[PDB]
C-alpha cells in the first residue's frame, strides 16, 4: 500500500493549487538561487560574433504550498509533474536561439523536499552574442557575456542569487573546452539591475575571458610573408647585368606578396577598421614594392654611373634587412604586450 | 490573501469567451504598440532580407477582465495567454520568425485593475526588403517592418503607436558591421484590401553602407595592379620576356580578381559601380599592354617615335587613371 499512499500524497498536494501564481504573491519576494554547470564551451564564431555553450541550469526556490509528510524526505518528479507547478520564467537576455533537449525525454528534473524546497534542473544549449573588437587581430582577447533573468517578474516580485560564492557558483568541466582557435582563461561572475519600458529587473551575469591562439596565423600567413620579403631582398645580391633575372625575381616576389595578401584577407571577416595583420601585410607589400623600385633605379643609373649603382646596392644590402628587422621588433613589441 | 487572488482570477476566467473581441459588435478596440529593438544583424544581399530581434508589447482594454479589491498589477504565468483574447497581429514582409522558448516561452501577460492588458513577446524575425544596388557599395537602403491585423477591420480594431515617436527604443544602441543606421520613422495608415480596410503601422530604417572594407579588400588590389602595369614603361624594350610576362601576369591577376568577385558577390544582374570600376581598371591594363603592342609594332621603323610614345605614356597613364578616379569618386560620393 506504500505506492497507494504515495499516490494519495501526490493527488493531494495539487488540490487547490494554482500554477499561474508565484509563491508568496502579494506577501513577499520569491528568492531564486541559481547555479550553472558548463559541460562544453562550444565553438566561437568571429564572423557572426556569437558563441555556443552547453549547460546544466540549476534553480532552487521555496513554495510553502508544497509541504508534505511521508516516509521519504526527498522526491524526484517525472517531467509531466514538473509542468503542473509554478516555475520561474528565466530567459537569457543576449541569447540568439537556444535549445532545450528532450531526447529521448525532456531533460528536466524536479526534486521536492519536506520543508517545501524545490530544485529544478535542465539541460540547455545557448547561442549568445559576443561583440568583438578586432583592432588587435589576431592578437586580441575578448570577454563573452552570458546574462539571464526573469522575463515577466520585476525586482519587486522575483530576485535571483547565486547558490554559493559567485566565483564557485559557475563550474566548468575539465574537458569542457571545445575551442580550436581560442584559449579559455577563466570566468567572472556578477549581478546587476536593468530597467526597461515595463519595469526594473535583476540580471545575473557571467563573463568568459578568451584569448586567441596565434600559431595558425604565424605558420600560415606571417612566415610566408617574411620569407617572401627575404626573397625579394635576396635580389640585391645578384649581379647588375642580369637585368631579366632580377626583373623576373622582383616581379614574381611582388606577385607572391599579392597572392599571400589575398589569401590572408580571405580568412578575415568583413570589418570596417584595419587589424594588426592589415598593417603587417601592407608594410611587407610596401617593402617588396620599394625593393623593386630600388632595382628600377639601379637599372636606370646603370651604364651611366656604375659607382653610384654599386654604392646603392651595397647600402641596400644593409638597410633593407635592418629596416625590416626594426619593423618586426616594433610590430611584435606593440601587440604581443597587451 | 493568495486564496482571494486565486478566487478573483478564476472568477474572471469563468465564462470568458476567447472567440469574441472586447466590445464585440460595438466600438472598435484600440491597441497600442511598443517595440524595443535588441539587435539587428545579418543584412543579406543574396537573400534580400534582414534579421531583427525585439521586444513587442501590446496594450489594450478589455472590460471583461476588470477586477477590484486587489491594489496590485497581476503579472500572470504566460500560459494564461492561451485562455484570453489577443490581437491577430502579423508582419506582412516576414519570411521566417519565431518566439524564443528557453527556458520557457518568452511571453508576458500583465493585468491592471481598470482592465488594461499588457501583452509582451520576444520575437526574432527575418523581414524582406528590396535593395537597389545600382550604386553598390556606395548605396543607401530603406528597410521596413509592416504590422497589420489579419482578420479584423477598422470597424473592429485600431492601431496606434503608444508614446508617439518614442514608441520605438533601442535604435541608438545598434552597431552594424557594414552599415550605419541614419534614421528611423513611424507611419500609421490604413490599407484598403478587397475584404475591407485594415489598420497598419510601419517602422522604417535608412542604412548607409560603410566603405572601409571594400577600400582595403576590393579597390586597392585593382589599383595596385594598374600601377604595376606601368612598370613596363620603365623597362628597356629589348627585355621582351620581362615586359610580356609582366603584361600577361597583370592581365591574369585582374581577370582572376574579376572572376572570383563575380563568383563570391551576390548575383545582381545589372550594372553596379564596382563592375564599372573593375572594367575600367581592366581597360587601363588592356591599353597599357596595347601601348607596348604599338611600340613593338613600330620600334624598328621609327625607334624615336616609339621612345617618345613610351615617355608620354609614363605621364598619360597615371594622369588618365587619376582623372578616372577623380570622376568616379565625384560621381559616386
Amino acid at each position, epitope marked *: 500500500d506504500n505506492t497507494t499512499v504515495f499516490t494519495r500524497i501526490l493527488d493531494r498536494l495539487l488540490d487547490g493549487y494554482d500554477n499561474r501564481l508565484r509563491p508568496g504573491l502579494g506577501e513577499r519576494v520569491t528568492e531564486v538561487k541559481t547555479d550553472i554547470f558548463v559541460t562544453s564551451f562550444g565553438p566561437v564564431s568571429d564572423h557572426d560574433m556569437e558563441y555556443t555553450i552547453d549547460v546544466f541550469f540549476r534553480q532552487s526556490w521555496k513554495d510553502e504550498r508544497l509541504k508534505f509528510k511521508g516516509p521519504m524526505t526527498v522526491l524526484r518528479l517525472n517531467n509531466l509533474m514538473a509542468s503542473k507547478i509554478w516555475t520561474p520564467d528565466t530567459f537569457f537576455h543576449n541569447g540568439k536561439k537556444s535549445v532545450a533537449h528532450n531526447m529521448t525525454m525532456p531533460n528536466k528534473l524536479l526534486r521536492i523536499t519536506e520543508d517545501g524546497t524545490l530544485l529544478y534542473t535542465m539541460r540547455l544549449t545557448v547561442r549568445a552574442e559576443c561583440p568583438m*573588437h578586432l583592432e588587435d587581430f589576431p592578437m586580441d582577447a575578448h570577454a563573452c557575456p552570458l546574462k539571464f533573468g526573469s522575463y515577466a517578474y520585476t525586482r519587486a516580485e522575483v530576485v535571483y542569487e547565486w547558490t554559493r560564492e559567485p566565483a564557485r557558483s559557475v563550474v566548468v568541466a575539465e574537458d569542457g573546452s571545445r575551442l580550436n582557435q581560442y584559449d579559455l582563461l577563466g570566468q567572472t561572475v556578477d*549581478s546587476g*539591475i536593468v530597467q526597461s519600458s515595463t519595469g526594473e529587473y535583476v540580471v545575473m551575469t557571467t563573463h568568459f575571458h578568451l584569448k586567441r591562439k596565434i600559431g595558425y596565423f604565424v605558420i600560415q600567413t606571417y612566415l610566408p610573408c617574411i620569407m617572401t620579403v627575404i626573397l625579394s631582398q635576396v635580389s640585391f645580391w645578384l649581379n647588375r647585368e642580369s637585368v631579366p633575372a632580377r626583373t623576373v625575381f622582383g616581379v614574381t616576389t611582388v606577385l607572391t606578396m599579392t597572392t599571400l595578401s589575398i589569401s590572408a584577407r580571405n580568412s578575415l571577416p568583413k570589418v570596417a577598421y584595419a587589424t594588426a595583420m592589415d598593417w603587417f601585410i601592407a608594410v611587407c607589400y610596401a617593402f617588396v614594392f620599394s625593393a623593386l623600385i630600388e632595382f628600377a633605379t639601379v637599372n636606370y643609373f646603370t651604364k651611366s654611373q656604375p659607382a653610384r649603382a654599386a654604392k646603392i646596392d651595397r647600402l641596400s644590402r644593409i638597410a633593407f634587412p635592418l629596416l625590416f628587422g626594426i619593423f618586426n621588433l616594433v610590430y611584435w613589441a606593440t601587440y604581443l604586450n597587451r | 490573501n493568495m486564496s482571494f487572488v486565486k478566487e478573483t482570477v478564476d472568477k474572471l476566467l469563468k465564462g470568458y469567451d476567447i472567440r469574441l473581441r472586447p466590445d464585440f459588435g460595438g466600438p472598435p478596440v484600440c491597441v497600442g504598440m511598443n517595440i524595443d529593438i535588441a539587435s539587428i544583424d545579418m543584412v543579406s544581399e543574396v537573400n534580400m532580407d534582414y534579421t531583427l530581434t525585439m521586444y513587442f508589447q501590446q496594450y489594450w482594454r478589455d472590460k471583461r477582465l476588470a477586477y477590484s479589491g486587489i491594489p496590485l498589477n497581476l503579472t500572470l504565468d504566460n500560459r494564461v495567454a492561451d485562455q484570453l483574447w489577443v490581437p491577430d497581429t502579423y508582419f506582412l514582409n516576414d519570411k521566417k520568425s519565431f518566439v524564443h522558448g528557453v527556458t520557457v516561452k518568452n511571453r508576458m501577460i500583465r493585468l491592471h485593475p481598470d482592465g488594461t492588458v499588457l501583452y509582451g513577446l520576444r520575437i526574432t524575425t527575418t523581414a524582406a526588403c528590396m535593395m537597389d544596388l545600382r550604386r553598390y557599395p556606395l548605396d543607401e537602403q530603406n528597410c521596413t517592418l509592416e504590422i497589420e491585423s489579419y482578420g479584423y477591420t477598422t470597424d473592429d480594431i485600431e492601431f496606434y503607436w503608444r508614446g508617439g515617436d518614442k514608441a520605438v527604443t533601442g535604435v541608438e544602441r545598434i552597431e552594424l558591421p557594414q552599415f550605419s543606421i541614419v534614421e528611423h520613422r513611424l507611419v500609421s495608415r490604413n490599407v484598403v484590401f478587397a475584404t475591407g480596410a485594415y489598420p497598419r503601422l510601419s517602422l522604417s530604417f535608412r542604412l548607409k553602407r560603410n566603405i572601409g572594407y571594400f577600400i582595403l579588400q576590393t579597390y586597392m588590389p585593382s589599383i595596385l595592379i594598374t600601377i604595376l602595369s606601368w612598370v613596363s614603361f620603365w623597362i628597356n624594350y629589348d627585355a621582351s620576356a620581362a615586359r610580356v610576362a609582366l603584361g600577361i601576369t597583370t592581365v591574369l591577376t585582374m581577370t582572376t580578381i574579376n572572376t572570383h568577385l563575380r563568383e563570391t558577390l551576390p548575383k545582381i544582374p545589372y550594372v553596379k559601380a564596382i563592375d564599372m570600376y573593375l572594367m575600367g581598371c581592366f581597360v587601363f591594363v588592356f591599353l597599357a599592354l596595347l601601348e607596348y603592342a604599338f611600340v613593338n609594332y613600330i620600334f624598328f621603323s621609327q625607334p624615336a617615335r616609339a621612345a617618345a610614345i613610351d615617355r608620354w605614356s609614363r605621364i598619360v597613364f597615371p594622369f588618365t587613371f587619376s582623372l578616372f578616379n577623380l570622376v568616379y569618386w565625384l560621381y559616386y560620393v
Partner: nanobody
Amino acid sequence: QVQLQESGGGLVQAGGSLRVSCAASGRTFTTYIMAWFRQAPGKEREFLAAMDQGRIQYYGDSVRGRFTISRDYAKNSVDLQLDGLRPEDTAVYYCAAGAGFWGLRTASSYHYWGQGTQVTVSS
C-alpha cells in the same frame, strides 16, 4: 584622438543631488562598457558603477541605492547622479571606458581614463 572630458563636481553641503557627467570624443563607445571610479586622497582606487551596451547596471556594494548611473548613447556620454552625499564621499571621481577583460570591476581593464573631477562634501 580620444578624450574623455568630465564636468560637474565642486562642493556640496553634506547632501543634495550632484550629477557628474562625462563626454567622449574621438571614438564611439556604444559597444563598450562605461564606468565610474573614485579616488580618496592617497587611498585605493575604487569601483563605483558601470553600464554596458545592454544597459545592465553594476554597482559597488558600498554605493548601492545612493548613486545612479546612466548613459546617453546618442550623445555618447554617461552621467552619475550622486544623492545623499556624505563627508566620506569627498574624493576625485574618474570616468572610464573599456571592454571589461578579466573583470569590469577591476581598474586595470579600462583602456581610456578621464582626467578626474573633485567632489567635496562639507559638513
